[PDB]
């Protein structure tokens, strides 16, 4: 509930930033709004790439941290670790 709210707020702020900075380029804005024009399932599959080190996800490090902490708490509760 709160993880998705923080993610939504950040995705709105980043869209505001890209709409402010769209005047800089024409084709770079194209990749940048690829994320925003993608279908929601693809958007969230992209935003959920915190794992490993591929780093294509644009979500910030703190938001990565809450999910990485919840995931290890859940693994400890499941007994995998």
């Amino acid at each position: 509930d709160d993880f998705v709210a923080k993610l939504q707020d950040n995705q709105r702020f980043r869209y505001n930033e890209v709409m402010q900075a769209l005047n800089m380029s024409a084709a770079l804005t194209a990749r940048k709004t690829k994320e925003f024009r993608s279908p929601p399932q693809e958007q969230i599959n992209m935003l959920l790439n915190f794992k490993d080190d591929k780093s294509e996800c644009p979500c910030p490090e703190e938001i990565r941290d809450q999910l990485l902490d919840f995931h290890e708490d859940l693994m400890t509760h499941c007994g995998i670790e």
């Binding site: 939504q8 707020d9 995705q11 709004t33 024009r37 993608s38 279908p39 969230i44």
Partner: peptide, 19 residues
């Protein structure tokens, strides 16, 4: 190109659908 760029934001969706 603004309307073409803006298609379906995730933040516009209600909370439960995003959850």
């Amino acid at each position: 190109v603004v309307a073409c760029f803006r298609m379906a934001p995730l933040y516009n969706l209600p909370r439960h659908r995003a959850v």
